């Protein structure tokens, strides 16, 4: 999961 930022 690529973090939101």
């Amino acid at each position: 999961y690529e973090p939101e930022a």
Partner: antibody
Amino acid sequence: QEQLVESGGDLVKPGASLTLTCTASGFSFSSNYWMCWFRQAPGKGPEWIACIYAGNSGSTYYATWAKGRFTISKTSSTTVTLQMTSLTAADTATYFCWRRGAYGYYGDLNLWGPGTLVTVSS
Amino acid sequence: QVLTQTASSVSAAVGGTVTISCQSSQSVYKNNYLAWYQQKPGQPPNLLIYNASTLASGVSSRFRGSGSGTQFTLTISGVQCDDAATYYCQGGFPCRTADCNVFGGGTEVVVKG
């Protein structure tokens, strides 16, 4: 221990192309961060160009002005490239590679290279 | 996004205080994804503060970050000649909806010795 080094910066003709490499030492691309490029023209401040997610995504992100002529890629577990095309004098700058830590870890993962200088000249 | 800083230059005598302002065109990520960097010629940005107000490791406590959302301040108390430098704010936003990061244009500190 953990470091980044940019390479590939050189004298290059207007209209030509150049590829820069950001090489990691002390770690390999895992996740929870992005590898990004900035540039800084003489007597100006640094400006964002692009980021690539280190994780499996490999999501790429570009400043509006950049998405034409710039391509950010992962080329190995320790290298990220910036390919730059149709260069003009406006592109003369020090190019820096940066590790962007996910929120919560920005300070922890913050890492910069010393920069590579690109000189667009006839 | 666009980040706008104080002005190009500010000054203070050894021991005095400098204030550097940074405004973001839109709220940074979760209101506190804002960093302060120092830069001297020939070197990469050197992180001072992250998460708007947290001192990076080994950085002197006379650097203070404040603010939230779109408005931020760096305060340098007890200015020393070694603080002569350019200072940049950098905001963070979600890559998938805006620029991953955005630097302000820089504020130079001139220290009067």
